[PDB]
RNA sequence: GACGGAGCCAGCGAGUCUAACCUUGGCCGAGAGGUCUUGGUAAUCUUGUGAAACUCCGUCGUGCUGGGGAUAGAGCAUUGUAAUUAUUGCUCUUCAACGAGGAAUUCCUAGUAAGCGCAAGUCAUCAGCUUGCGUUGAUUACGUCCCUGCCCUUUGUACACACC
RNA sequence: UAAUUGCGAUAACGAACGAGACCUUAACCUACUAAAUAGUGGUGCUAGCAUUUGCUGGUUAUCCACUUCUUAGAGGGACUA
RNA sequence: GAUGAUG
């Protein structure tokens, strides 16, 4: 039975006393994505509450792998300058977007994020190689960590460009971007760009 | 970098050739001896001098060291 | 005298002085219930110490905090750390050791900031720029 | 087309004119005891699992 | 148990009290409410031309409660804002003295506030009764 | 005379330009640097 | 370093000649061993007390009182 | 007779010799006092360009002077205050005394 | 995101002799500002410097539009002997360029970049400047000698004003 | 190695300036010496809401005690142990 | 083992 205190503490919050859920709603106990090359670089094994941690992840090379992927998605929305900082908006925008996803699909909203990321990381990329000034591209592979880093970039960049001069609010454009990407649908801006990079990478082998 | 300078290498060297019996393999004790054995002008330098001496006692334990 | 204890926590310029004494579970921040903390979104940060251990541990104690300095975000980090430290200092003085160790294990395993302050502090600005490491634009023609 | 997976078992030092590439030795998860030398674009360590689009290529080097 | 004003969110309390004063109709409205704008920093007059004044009175009544004494100056600071200034950047600009003065004069007449030594106003005995009765009403309406 | 640049002058070289008035020193910037050690203004950080 | 403000005294003067002015700058480094107030030597000097010779024992003995 | 003894200087070591002399002098007479209340140090600043003519890379310099005010409260007869005001003259320290 | 009401939090500093300085509080005015008092030669007063971004609730609804406020007209005030070639501040009217920017090019590796303002210098008056201060706080390397340059050795030289 | 920083090699041996040391400033101390011109608690007087010994407040001419938060003086601490 | 005159 819920504890009674001099200062009342609602029962809905007291339910979390036996398990931690993000934003008090979404759970972490069933989220796993099959791409075996990224299980060590998507952090969904430590539940958190508010997607606002203030962690010190910049001091060492690979520490950013242990940051929960929900906050690393949150962190990428504070861009295009005017919105640098202003992290609270990011915590709220992720809240609306997740609620929307579970309305539109009836699947765990976090699972959508992990699926979309694992379907967007480009496997093959290219670099400039030459000598004296003449430059031609070369085919190379792409590391696990970088597939996540570039995956999130494409997702938030696509959502942000849509929200510009468009009636749909930011929370939605990211919601439809995430739904499509996990669906492996060419309508998504993220998947369009994954295929374009891979196609150029194959022509330059 | 963690490369000591000659004012530390030589000061520790002088201590071992004159006070081997009293030094130990422990920083804290060696910290207090250097106060009773040598006149040093700072807490920072005194820590460094004693730290190297501990390091040299460890070397001498495994076998003699040139110099 | 009534059993009591004092602790505090910090982040940037925020400081929260938490006073604890045996009681009936009162928990209050700046004279208002914990429930009314603002900004709203970060409220579960203030709740975090209570959940990670269990509300049972708080039924026999009264906690009153008062926070000053800093900004709207750093304060919430001061508050949660004052609550975490206060509870472990109360078990330090009036309850056995085995309980103190277990409680510190729950907090440490989750978020070190609940017990140990953040070491980061700002760097001074330097002349020739707008900030610590930024510099004014340079021109050659 | 299919994809094949291998596992990094050593890092052989940076490559590329500007240093943006890394040379790696991989170890196929299936039919192990086959190892190829190839290049990577971002940060890479030991034990990382890579997704090679094609298998039979081996990478040039500065030496 | 009992109740104090500090036990209810600021937004909930201010909305509840502004409605109450509007209904009773015993608070003086200075008459030029429909013309002026609450601070020089603003560029348009308040939207709720009906009940913006009773809303300001609801806030200031609580603000005295929390603190010991205040004044026209403290309230110019409290409700001040960021001027635009167009091409040139922003700067803090104090609020309108006339409004924040005639709200303080009005409050005493209805009996919520009294002057105090050291200068500035002070919550009176009557004011505490008025603000706490309503407080219990807002909490009771949590349904 | 009651105000302005010309109402003031460095107490050492009567220069109108650069005068520093904080703490009522009333010495020009070039003269402050020379005399700082004697006035008691040292350079630390 | 700090020793400059501890152990150095300086002076700069002008001299008038028919060719034109010329300057003289003097610097004197006081010996730190003679310092009446302040540090007695440079920050980086270390000296050690010479141990006293000790001879071993013959056989344990006790002294009564 | 109640007194306040405010001390000030720009060099702590001297300020400490005079102040510590005050407490030891009074405590051998077993007077009642409030120990030396050390007020926050106040630091002055003057930031100016190094160049005297206005050419070269823009470089600035900062200076500082420090003040170390103290004050001590005493309760003693008149015959002893007369000499308390006359003891402890030390260059670099300014002393002021307020009665009642 | 603009606008209108509420929420409501810093630190570094400064302040009256051959003298008027920082200014609370009451009253008057829409505003600017006026007026009678008061505290401070300062961990005491101004000063919790109740600062801005921020959060909450509403008005607006992809429209050169309630984005932007340049350019002009009309009145009301402050500082100064004296402002017209409007010092600045307030009020209503006017409501242009600008729809994310060609070749080029600058700064930056964490409480850092970037966003937001406050004190000081200048000052009778006027920050779009500078020196500091805090507040909110990411992405991306943990490498290389391709470009631009630095340090050490070897080697060639008809250079010495020294590869201009 | 950040370093003409060291290990060493060795027709050179032993020295001097530079770097480091040094000084300022920022981060810790429930340890020392204190402090209404800083704070906290208790008691007097006291408003408001409940009332079982409660919650939030006011009172600078009411007093007492104390030093976690605040100021410093003097120290401790990191040396890659 | 692209191009790279001049004062």
mmCIF file with all atom_site columns, N, CA and C (backbone and C1' of nucleotides) in Angstrom, chain C residues 12-13 38 69-74 120 123 125 128 130 132-134 137, chain I residues 7-10 106-109 111-115 131-133 135-137:
data_model
loop_
_atom_site.group_PDB
_atom_site.id
_atom_site.type_symbol
_atom_site.label_atom_id
_atom_site.label_alt_id
_atom_site.label_comp_id
_atom_site.label_asym_id
_atom_site.label_entity_id
_atom_site.label_seq_id
_atom_site.pdbx_PDB_ins_code
_atom_site.Cartn_x
_atom_site.Cartn_y
_atom_site.Cartn_z
_atom_site.occupancy
_atom_site.B_iso_or_equiv
_atom_site.pdbx_formal_charge
_atom_site.auth_seq_id
_atom_site.auth_comp_id
_atom_site.auth_asym_id
_atom_site.auth_atom_id
_atom_site.pdbx_PDB_model_num
ATOM 1   N N     . UNK C 1 12  ? 27.348 24.801 -9.624  1.00 0.00 ? 12  UNK C N     1
ATOM 2   C CA    . UNK C 1 12  ? 27.568 26.196 -9.965  1.00 0.00 ? 12  UNK C CA    1
ATOM 3   C C     . UNK C 1 12  ? 27.367 26.988 -8.676  1.00 0.00 ? 12  UNK C C     1
ATOM 4   N N     . UNK C 1 13  ? 26.589 28.063 -8.681  1.00 0.00 ? 13  UNK C N     1
ATOM 5   C CA    . UNK C 1 13  ? 26.446 28.931 -7.523  1.00 0.00 ? 13  UNK C CA    1
ATOM 6   C C     . UNK C 1 13  ? 25.286 28.542 -6.622  1.00 0.00 ? 13  UNK C C     1
ATOM 7   N N     . UNK C 1 38  ? 9.520  24.087 -9.193  1.00 0.00 ? 38  UNK C N     1
ATOM 8   C CA    . UNK C 1 38  ? 9.563  24.570 -10.561 1.00 0.00 ? 38  UNK C CA    1
ATOM 9   C C     . UNK C 1 38  ? 11.012 24.780 -10.975 1.00 0.00 ? 38  UNK C C     1
ATOM 10  N N     . UNK C 1 69  ? 20.943 31.308 -4.653  1.00 0.00 ? 69  UNK C N     1
ATOM 11  C CA    . UNK C 1 69  ? 22.014 31.443 -5.616  1.00 0.00 ? 69  UNK C CA    1
ATOM 12  C C     . UNK C 1 69  ? 21.837 30.554 -6.834  1.00 0.00 ? 69  UNK C C     1
ATOM 13  N N     . UNK C 1 70  ? 22.569 30.900 -7.887  1.00 0.00 ? 70  UNK C N     1
ATOM 14  C CA    . UNK C 1 70  ? 22.510 30.144 -9.118  1.00 0.00 ? 70  UNK C CA    1
ATOM 15  C C     . UNK C 1 70  ? 21.308 30.513 -9.970  1.00 0.00 ? 70  UNK C C     1
ATOM 16  N N     . UNK C 1 71  ? 20.815 29.522 -10.711 1.00 0.00 ? 71  UNK C N     1
ATOM 17  C CA    . UNK C 1 71  ? 19.717 29.719 -11.632 1.00 0.00 ? 71  UNK C CA    1
ATOM 18  C C     . UNK C 1 71  ? 18.689 28.611 -11.501 1.00 0.00 ? 71  UNK C C     1
ATOM 19  N N     . UNK C 1 72  ? 17.676 28.687 -12.364 1.00 0.00 ? 72  UNK C N     1
ATOM 20  C CA    . UNK C 1 72  ? 16.511 27.835 -12.194 1.00 0.00 ? 72  UNK C CA    1
ATOM 21  C C     . UNK C 1 72  ? 16.833 26.362 -12.367 1.00 0.00 ? 72  UNK C C     1
ATOM 22  N N     . UNK C 1 73  ? 17.941 26.024 -13.009 1.00 0.00 ? 73  UNK C N     1
ATOM 23  C CA    . UNK C 1 73  ? 18.291 24.640 -13.264 1.00 0.00 ? 73  UNK C CA    1
ATOM 24  C C     . UNK C 1 73  ? 19.277 24.126 -12.234 1.00 0.00 ? 73  UNK C C     1
ATOM 25  N N     . UNK C 1 74  ? 20.348 24.879 -11.979 1.00 0.00 ? 74  UNK C N     1
ATOM 26  C CA    . UNK C 1 74  ? 21.339 24.424 -11.015 1.00 0.00 ? 74  UNK C CA    1
ATOM 27  C C     . UNK C 1 74  ? 20.727 24.237 -9.643  1.00 0.00 ? 74  UNK C C     1
ATOM 28  N N     . UNK C 1 120 ? 33.169 20.753 -12.233 1.00 0.00 ? 120 UNK C N     1
ATOM 29  C CA    . UNK C 1 120 ? 33.304 21.763 -13.268 1.00 0.00 ? 120 UNK C CA    1
ATOM 30  C C     . UNK C 1 120 ? 33.080 23.150 -12.697 1.00 0.00 ? 120 UNK C C     1
ATOM 31  N N     . UNK C 1 123 ? 35.750 29.163 -16.624 1.00 0.00 ? 123 UNK C N     1
ATOM 32  C CA    . UNK C 1 123 ? 37.065 29.716 -16.896 1.00 0.00 ? 123 UNK C CA    1
ATOM 33  C C     . UNK C 1 123 ? 36.969 31.208 -17.175 1.00 0.00 ? 123 UNK C C     1
ATOM 34  N N     . UNK C 1 125 ? 37.353 34.853 -18.899 1.00 0.00 ? 125 UNK C N     1
ATOM 35  C CA    . UNK C 1 125 ? 37.549 35.420 -20.219 1.00 0.00 ? 125 UNK C CA    1
ATOM 36  C C     . UNK C 1 125 ? 38.961 35.965 -20.339 1.00 0.00 ? 125 UNK C C     1
ATOM 37  N N     . UNK C 1 128 ? 41.079 40.024 -26.043 1.00 0.00 ? 128 UNK C N     1
ATOM 38  C CA    . UNK C 1 128 ? 41.175 39.618 -27.425 1.00 0.00 ? 128 UNK C CA    1
ATOM 39  C C     . UNK C 1 128 ? 40.088 38.680 -27.874 1.00 0.00 ? 128 UNK C C     1
ATOM 40  N N     . UNK C 1 130 ? 35.562 37.379 -27.192 1.00 0.00 ? 130 UNK C N     1
ATOM 41  C CA    . UNK C 1 130 ? 34.271 37.512 -26.542 1.00 0.00 ? 130 UNK C CA    1
ATOM 42  C C     . UNK C 1 130 ? 34.080 36.512 -25.417 1.00 0.00 ? 130 UNK C C     1
ATOM 43  N N     . UNK C 1 132 ? 35.958 32.702 -23.251 1.00 0.00 ? 132 UNK C N     1
ATOM 44  C CA    . UNK C 1 132 ? 37.135 32.052 -22.695 1.00 0.00 ? 132 UNK C CA    1
ATOM 45  C C     . UNK C 1 132 ? 38.124 31.683 -23.783 1.00 0.00 ? 132 UNK C C     1
ATOM 46  N N     . UNK C 1 133 ? 37.666 30.969 -24.802 1.00 0.00 ? 133 UNK C N     1
ATOM 47  C CA    . UNK C 1 133 ? 38.537 30.512 -25.866 1.00 0.00 ? 133 UNK C CA    1
ATOM 48  C C     . UNK C 1 133 ? 38.213 31.093 -27.229 1.00 0.00 ? 133 UNK C C     1
ATOM 49  N N     . UNK C 1 134 ? 37.082 31.760 -27.392 1.00 0.00 ? 134 UNK C N     1
ATOM 50  C CA    . UNK C 1 134 ? 36.781 32.404 -28.654 1.00 0.00 ? 134 UNK C CA    1
ATOM 51  C C     . UNK C 1 134 ? 37.580 33.691 -28.805 1.00 0.00 ? 134 UNK C C     1
ATOM 52  N N     . UNK C 1 137 ? 37.036 38.064 -34.862 1.00 0.00 ? 137 UNK C N     1
ATOM 53  C CA    . UNK C 1 137 ? 37.364 37.776 -36.250 1.00 0.00 ? 137 UNK C CA    1
ATOM 54  C C     . UNK C 1 137 ? 38.588 38.573 -36.674 1.00 0.00 ? 137 UNK C C     1
ATOM 55  P P     . G   I 2 7   ? 3.385  36.271 -10.287 1.00 0.00 ? 7   G   I P     1
ATOM 56  O "O5'" . G   I 2 7   ? 4.245  34.949 -10.460 1.00 0.00 ? 7   G   I "O5'" 1
ATOM 57  C "C5'" . G   I 2 7   ? 3.632  33.690 -10.251 1.00 0.00 ? 7   G   I "C5'" 1
ATOM 58  C "C4'" . G   I 2 7   ? 4.487  32.556 -10.743 1.00 0.00 ? 7   G   I "C4'" 1
ATOM 59  C "C3'" . G   I 2 7   ? 5.918  32.557 -10.262 1.00 0.00 ? 7   G   I "C3'" 1
ATOM 60  O "O3'" . G   I 2 7   ? 6.046  32.012 -8.965  1.00 0.00 ? 7   G   I "O3'" 1
ATOM 61  C "C1'" . G   I 2 7   ? 5.858  32.127 -12.585 1.00 0.00 ? 7   G   I "C1'" 1
ATOM 62  P P     . C   I 2 8   ? 6.482  32.949 -7.747  1.00 0.00 ? 8   C   I P     1
ATOM 63  O "O5'" . C   I 2 8   ? 8.040  33.164 -7.982  1.00 0.00 ? 8   C   I "O5'" 1
ATOM 64  C "C5'" . C   I 2 8   ? 8.911  32.059 -8.162  1.00 0.00 ? 8   C   I "C5'" 1
ATOM 65  C "C4'" . C   I 2 8   ? 10.141 32.460 -8.929  1.00 0.00 ? 8   C   I "C4'" 1
ATOM 66  C "C3'" . C   I 2 8   ? 10.885 33.669 -8.394  1.00 0.00 ? 8   C   I "C3'" 1
ATOM 67  O "O3'" . C   I 2 8   ? 11.757 33.346 -7.333  1.00 0.00 ? 8   C   I "O3'" 1
ATOM 68  C "C1'" . C   I 2 8   ? 10.573 33.898 -10.717 1.00 0.00 ? 8   C   I "C1'" 1
ATOM 69  P P     . C   I 2 9   ? 12.661 34.479 -6.668  1.00 0.00 ? 9   C   I P     1
ATOM 70  O "O5'" . C   I 2 9   ? 14.129 34.124 -7.146  1.00 0.00 ? 9   C   I "O5'" 1
ATOM 71  C "C5'" . C   I 2 9   ? 14.734 32.903 -6.758  1.00 0.00 ? 9   C   I "C5'" 1
ATOM 72  C "C4'" . C   I 2 9   ? 15.849 32.504 -7.692  1.00 0.00 ? 9   C   I "C4'" 1
ATOM 73  C "C3'" . C   I 2 9   ? 17.052 33.420 -7.739  1.00 0.00 ? 9   C   I "C3'" 1
ATOM 74  O "O3'" . C   I 2 9   ? 17.926 33.230 -6.647  1.00 0.00 ? 9   C   I "O3'" 1
ATOM 75  C "C1'" . C   I 2 9   ? 16.440 32.794 -9.932  1.00 0.00 ? 9   C   I "C1'" 1
ATOM 76  P P     . A   I 2 10  ? 18.993 34.355 -6.248  1.00 0.00 ? 10  A   I P     1
ATOM 77  O "O5'" . A   I 2 10  ? 20.242 34.069 -7.189  1.00 0.00 ? 10  A   I "O5'" 1
ATOM 78  C "C5'" . A   I 2 10  ? 21.451 34.795 -7.014  1.00 0.00 ? 10  A   I "C5'" 1
ATOM 79  C "C4'" . A   I 2 10  ? 22.507 34.416 -8.023  1.00 0.00 ? 10  A   I "C4'" 1
ATOM 80  C "C3'" . A   I 2 10  ? 23.827 35.150 -7.879  1.00 0.00 ? 10  A   I "C3'" 1
ATOM 81  O "O3'" . A   I 2 10  ? 24.669 34.515 -6.940  1.00 0.00 ? 10  A   I "O3'" 1
ATOM 82  C "C1'" . A   I 2 10  ? 23.129 35.193 -10.141 1.00 0.00 ? 10  A   I "C1'" 1
ATOM 83  P P     . U   I 2 106 ? 40.548 32.488 -43.209 1.00 0.00 ? 106 U   I P     1
ATOM 84  O "O5'" . U   I 2 106 ? 40.100 33.022 -41.791 1.00 0.00 ? 106 U   I "O5'" 1
ATOM 85  C "C5'" . U   I 2 106 ? 40.054 34.405 -41.505 1.00 0.00 ? 106 U   I "C5'" 1
ATOM 86  C "C4'" . U   I 2 106 ? 39.141 34.659 -40.342 1.00 0.00 ? 106 U   I "C4'" 1
ATOM 87  C "C3'" . U   I 2 106 ? 39.314 33.713 -39.175 1.00 0.00 ? 106 U   I "C3'" 1
ATOM 88  O "O3'" . U   I 2 106 ? 40.377 34.089 -38.325 1.00 0.00 ? 106 U   I "O3'" 1
ATOM 89  C "C1'" . U   I 2 106 ? 37.023 33.921 -39.695 1.00 0.00 ? 106 U   I "C1'" 1
ATOM 90  P P     . C   I 2 107 ? 41.033 33.015 -37.340 1.00 0.00 ? 107 C   I P     1
ATOM 91  O "O5'" . C   I 2 107 ? 39.868 32.662 -36.328 1.00 0.00 ? 107 C   I "O5'" 1
ATOM 92  C "C5'" . C   I 2 107 ? 39.770 33.344 -35.097 1.00 0.00 ? 107 C   I "C5'" 1
ATOM 93  C "C4'" . C   I 2 107 ? 38.710 32.749 -34.211 1.00 0.00 ? 107 C   I "C4'" 1
ATOM 94  C "C3'" . C   I 2 107 ? 38.962 31.359 -33.678 1.00 0.00 ? 107 C   I "C3'" 1
ATOM 95  O "O3'" . C   I 2 107 ? 39.862 31.341 -32.596 1.00 0.00 ? 107 C   I "O3'" 1
ATOM 96  C "C1'" . C   I 2 107 ? 36.744 31.523 -34.428 1.00 0.00 ? 107 C   I "C1'" 1
ATOM 97  P P     . C   I 2 108 ? 40.759 30.048 -32.341 1.00 0.00 ? 108 C   I P     1
ATOM 98  O "O5'" . C   I 2 108 ? 39.751 29.019 -31.673 1.00 0.00 ? 108 C   I "O5'" 1
ATOM 99  C "C5'" . C   I 2 108 ? 39.069 29.343 -30.477 1.00 0.00 ? 108 C   I "C5'" 1
ATOM 100 C "C4'" . C   I 2 108 ? 37.930 28.396 -30.200 1.00 0.00 ? 108 C   I "C4'" 1
ATOM 101 C "C3'" . C   I 2 108 ? 38.289 26.928 -30.161 1.00 0.00 ? 108 C   I "C3'" 1
ATOM 102 O "O3'" . C   I 2 108 ? 38.855 26.540 -28.928 1.00 0.00 ? 108 C   I "O3'" 1
ATOM 103 C "C1'" . C   I 2 108 ? 36.365 27.223 -31.477 1.00 0.00 ? 108 C   I "C1'" 1
ATOM 104 P P     . U   I 2 109 ? 40.058 25.484 -28.879 1.00 0.00 ? 109 U   I P     1
ATOM 105 O "O5'" . U   I 2 109 ? 39.340 24.126 -28.499 1.00 0.00 ? 109 U   I "O5'" 1
ATOM 106 C "C5'" . U   I 2 109 ? 38.267 24.137 -27.582 1.00 0.00 ? 109 U   I "C5'" 1
ATOM 107 C "C4'" . U   I 2 109 ? 37.833 22.756 -27.178 1.00 0.00 ? 109 U   I "C4'" 1
ATOM 108 C "C3'" . U   I 2 109 ? 38.887 21.888 -26.496 1.00 0.00 ? 109 U   I "C3'" 1
ATOM 109 O "O3'" . U   I 2 109 ? 38.265 21.102 -25.485 1.00 0.00 ? 109 U   I "O3'" 1
ATOM 110 C "C1'" . U   I 2 109 ? 38.031 20.771 -28.364 1.00 0.00 ? 109 U   I "C1'" 1
ATOM 111 P P     . G   I 2 111 ? 35.826 21.442 -18.020 1.00 0.00 ? 111 G   I P     1
ATOM 112 O "O5'" . G   I 2 111 ? 34.415 22.126 -17.794 1.00 0.00 ? 111 G   I "O5'" 1
ATOM 113 C "C5'" . G   I 2 111 ? 34.312 23.502 -17.473 1.00 0.00 ? 111 G   I "C5'" 1
ATOM 114 C "C4'" . G   I 2 111 ? 33.264 24.165 -18.320 1.00 0.00 ? 111 G   I "C4'" 1
ATOM 115 C "C3'" . G   I 2 111 ? 32.906 25.590 -17.928 1.00 0.00 ? 111 G   I "C3'" 1
ATOM 116 O "O3'" . G   I 2 111 ? 32.500 26.294 -19.091 1.00 0.00 ? 111 G   I "O3'" 1
ATOM 117 C "C1'" . G   I 2 111 ? 30.999 24.269 -17.830 1.00 0.00 ? 111 G   I "C1'" 1
ATOM 118 P P     . U   I 2 112 ? 33.310 27.568 -19.590 1.00 0.00 ? 112 U   I P     1
ATOM 119 O "O5'" . U   I 2 112 ? 33.699 27.198 -21.083 1.00 0.00 ? 112 U   I "O5'" 1
ATOM 120 C "C5'" . U   I 2 112 ? 35.039 27.293 -21.532 1.00 0.00 ? 112 U   I "C5'" 1
ATOM 121 C "C4'" . U   I 2 112 ? 35.215 26.644 -22.876 1.00 0.00 ? 112 U   I "C4'" 1
ATOM 122 C "C3'" . U   I 2 112 ? 34.323 27.181 -23.981 1.00 0.00 ? 112 U   I "C3'" 1
ATOM 123 O "O3'" . U   I 2 112 ? 34.842 28.340 -24.596 1.00 0.00 ? 112 U   I "O3'" 1
ATOM 124 C "C1'" . U   I 2 112 ? 34.210 24.842 -23.965 1.00 0.00 ? 112 U   I "C1'" 1
ATOM 125 P P     . A   I 2 113 ? 33.883 29.555 -24.986 1.00 0.00 ? 113 A   I P     1
ATOM 126 O "O5'" . A   I 2 113 ? 33.209 29.069 -26.335 1.00 0.00 ? 113 A   I "O5'" 1
ATOM 127 C "C5'" . A   I 2 113 ? 33.976 28.909 -27.517 1.00 0.00 ? 113 A   I "C5'" 1
ATOM 128 C "C4'" . A   I 2 113 ? 33.150 28.319 -28.631 1.00 0.00 ? 113 A   I "C4'" 1
ATOM 129 C "C3'" . A   I 2 113 ? 31.923 29.110 -29.029 1.00 0.00 ? 113 A   I "C3'" 1
ATOM 130 O "O3'" . A   I 2 113 ? 32.238 30.122 -29.959 1.00 0.00 ? 113 A   I "O3'" 1
ATOM 131 C "C1'" . A   I 2 113 ? 31.343 26.839 -28.734 1.00 0.00 ? 113 A   I "C1'" 1
ATOM 132 P P     . A   I 2 114 ? 31.555 31.558 -29.855 1.00 0.00 ? 114 A   I P     1
ATOM 133 O "O5'" . A   I 2 114 ? 30.012 31.220 -29.873 1.00 0.00 ? 114 A   I "O5'" 1
ATOM 134 C "C5'" . A   I 2 114 ? 29.420 30.606 -31.001 1.00 0.00 ? 114 A   I "C5'" 1
ATOM 135 C "C4'" . A   I 2 114 ? 27.979 30.266 -30.740 1.00 0.00 ? 114 A   I "C4'" 1
ATOM 136 C "C3'" . A   I 2 114 ? 27.171 31.332 -30.036 1.00 0.00 ? 114 A   I "C3'" 1
ATOM 137 O "O3'" . A   I 2 114 ? 26.699 32.322 -30.914 1.00 0.00 ? 114 A   I "O3'" 1
ATOM 138 C "C1'" . A   I 2 114 ? 26.827 29.278 -28.960 1.00 0.00 ? 114 A   I "C1'" 1
ATOM 139 P P     . G   I 2 115 ? 26.117 33.681 -30.323 1.00 0.00 ? 115 G   I P     1
ATOM 140 O "O5'" . G   I 2 115 ? 24.885 33.226 -29.434 1.00 0.00 ? 115 G   I "O5'" 1
ATOM 141 C "C5'" . G   I 2 115 ? 23.635 32.936 -30.026 1.00 0.00 ? 115 G   I "C5'" 1
ATOM 142 C "C4'" . G   I 2 115 ? 22.571 32.672 -28.990 1.00 0.00 ? 115 G   I "C4'" 1
ATOM 143 C "C3'" . G   I 2 115 ? 22.213 33.831 -28.083 1.00 0.00 ? 115 G   I "C3'" 1
ATOM 144 O "O3'" . G   I 2 115 ? 21.371 34.781 -28.698 1.00 0.00 ? 115 G   I "O3'" 1
ATOM 145 C "C1'" . G   I 2 115 ? 22.426 31.876 -26.801 1.00 0.00 ? 115 G   I "C1'" 1
ATOM 146 P P     . U   I 2 131 ? 38.221 43.070 -24.728 1.00 0.00 ? 131 U   I P     1
ATOM 147 O "O5'" . U   I 2 131 ? 38.233 43.675 -23.261 1.00 0.00 ? 131 U   I "O5'" 1
ATOM 148 C "C5'" . U   I 2 131 ? 39.446 44.020 -22.622 1.00 0.00 ? 131 U   I "C5'" 1
ATOM 149 C "C4'" . U   I 2 131 ? 39.265 44.130 -21.133 1.00 0.00 ? 131 U   I "C4'" 1
ATOM 150 C "C3'" . U   I 2 131 ? 38.773 42.889 -20.413 1.00 0.00 ? 131 U   I "C3'" 1
ATOM 151 O "O3'" . U   I 2 131 ? 39.822 41.988 -20.128 1.00 0.00 ? 131 U   I "O3'" 1
ATOM 152 C "C1'" . U   I 2 131 ? 37.556 44.772 -19.680 1.00 0.00 ? 131 U   I "C1'" 1
ATOM 153 P P     . G   I 2 132 ? 39.514 40.466 -19.750 1.00 0.00 ? 132 G   I P     1
ATOM 154 O "O5'" . G   I 2 132 ? 38.872 40.564 -18.303 1.00 0.00 ? 132 G   I "O5'" 1
ATOM 155 C "C5'" . G   I 2 132 ? 37.970 39.578 -17.832 1.00 0.00 ? 132 G   I "C5'" 1
ATOM 156 C "C4'" . G   I 2 132 ? 37.103 40.117 -16.721 1.00 0.00 ? 132 G   I "C4'" 1
ATOM 157 C "C3'" . G   I 2 132 ? 35.971 39.214 -16.257 1.00 0.00 ? 132 G   I "C3'" 1
ATOM 158 O "O3'" . G   I 2 132 ? 36.405 38.256 -15.317 1.00 0.00 ? 132 G   I "O3'" 1
ATOM 159 C "C1'" . G   I 2 132 ? 35.148 41.391 -16.607 1.00 0.00 ? 132 G   I "C1'" 1
ATOM 160 P P     . C   I 2 133 ? 35.822 36.774 -15.329 1.00 0.00 ? 133 C   I P     1
ATOM 161 O "O5'" . C   I 2 133 ? 34.329 36.946 -14.825 1.00 0.00 ? 133 C   I "O5'" 1
ATOM 162 C "C5'" . C   I 2 133 ? 34.049 37.271 -13.472 1.00 0.00 ? 133 C   I "C5'" 1
ATOM 163 C "C4'" . C   I 2 133 ? 32.624 37.727 -13.289 1.00 0.00 ? 133 C   I "C4'" 1
ATOM 164 C "C3'" . C   I 2 133 ? 31.568 36.661 -13.512 1.00 0.00 ? 133 C   I "C3'" 1
ATOM 165 O "O3'" . C   I 2 133 ? 31.405 35.797 -12.410 1.00 0.00 ? 133 C   I "O3'" 1
ATOM 166 C "C1'" . C   I 2 133 ? 30.921 38.643 -14.593 1.00 0.00 ? 133 C   I "C1'" 1
ATOM 167 P P     . U   I 2 135 ? 26.532 30.687 -12.635 1.00 0.00 ? 135 U   I P     1
ATOM 168 O "O5'" . U   I 2 135 ? 25.158 30.638 -13.416 1.00 0.00 ? 135 U   I "O5'" 1
ATOM 169 C "C5'" . U   I 2 135 ? 24.017 31.284 -12.892 1.00 0.00 ? 135 U   I "C5'" 1
ATOM 170 C "C4'" . U   I 2 135 ? 22.991 31.527 -13.962 1.00 0.00 ? 135 U   I "C4'" 1
ATOM 171 C "C3'" . U   I 2 135 ? 22.681 30.338 -14.840 1.00 0.00 ? 135 U   I "C3'" 1
ATOM 172 O "O3'" . U   I 2 135 ? 21.716 29.497 -14.251 1.00 0.00 ? 135 U   I "O3'" 1
ATOM 173 C "C1'" . U   I 2 135 ? 23.004 32.281 -16.172 1.00 0.00 ? 135 U   I "C1'" 1
ATOM 174 P P     . U   I 2 136 ? 21.606 27.970 -14.693 1.00 0.00 ? 136 U   I P     1
ATOM 175 O "O5'" . U   I 2 136 ? 21.360 28.008 -16.263 1.00 0.00 ? 136 U   I "O5'" 1
ATOM 176 C "C5'" . U   I 2 136 ? 20.053 27.897 -16.796 1.00 0.00 ? 136 U   I "C5'" 1
ATOM 177 C "C4'" . U   I 2 136 ? 20.050 27.441 -18.239 1.00 0.00 ? 136 U   I "C4'" 1
ATOM 178 C "C3'" . U   I 2 136 ? 20.836 26.192 -18.587 1.00 0.00 ? 136 U   I "C3'" 1
ATOM 179 O "O3'" . U   I 2 136 ? 20.140 25.013 -18.244 1.00 0.00 ? 136 U   I "O3'" 1
ATOM 180 C "C1'" . U   I 2 136 ? 21.229 27.855 -20.208 1.00 0.00 ? 136 U   I "C1'" 1
ATOM 181 P P     . G   I 2 137 ? 20.767 23.560 -18.497 1.00 0.00 ? 137 G   I P     1
ATOM 182 O "O5'" . G   I 2 137 ? 21.777 23.740 -19.712 1.00 0.00 ? 137 G   I "O5'" 1
ATOM 183 C "C5'" . G   I 2 137 ? 21.481 23.165 -20.978 1.00 0.00 ? 137 G   I "C5'" 1
ATOM 184 C "C4'" . G   I 2 137 ? 22.612 23.319 -21.967 1.00 0.00 ? 137 G   I "C4'" 1
ATOM 185 C "C3'" . G   I 2 137 ? 23.803 22.396 -21.810 1.00 0.00 ? 137 G   I "C3'" 1
ATOM 186 O "O3'" . G   I 2 137 ? 23.581 21.099 -22.311 1.00 0.00 ? 137 G   I "O3'" 1
ATOM 187 C "C1'" . G   I 2 137 ? 24.568 24.578 -22.139 1.00 0.00 ? 137 G   I "C1'" 1
#
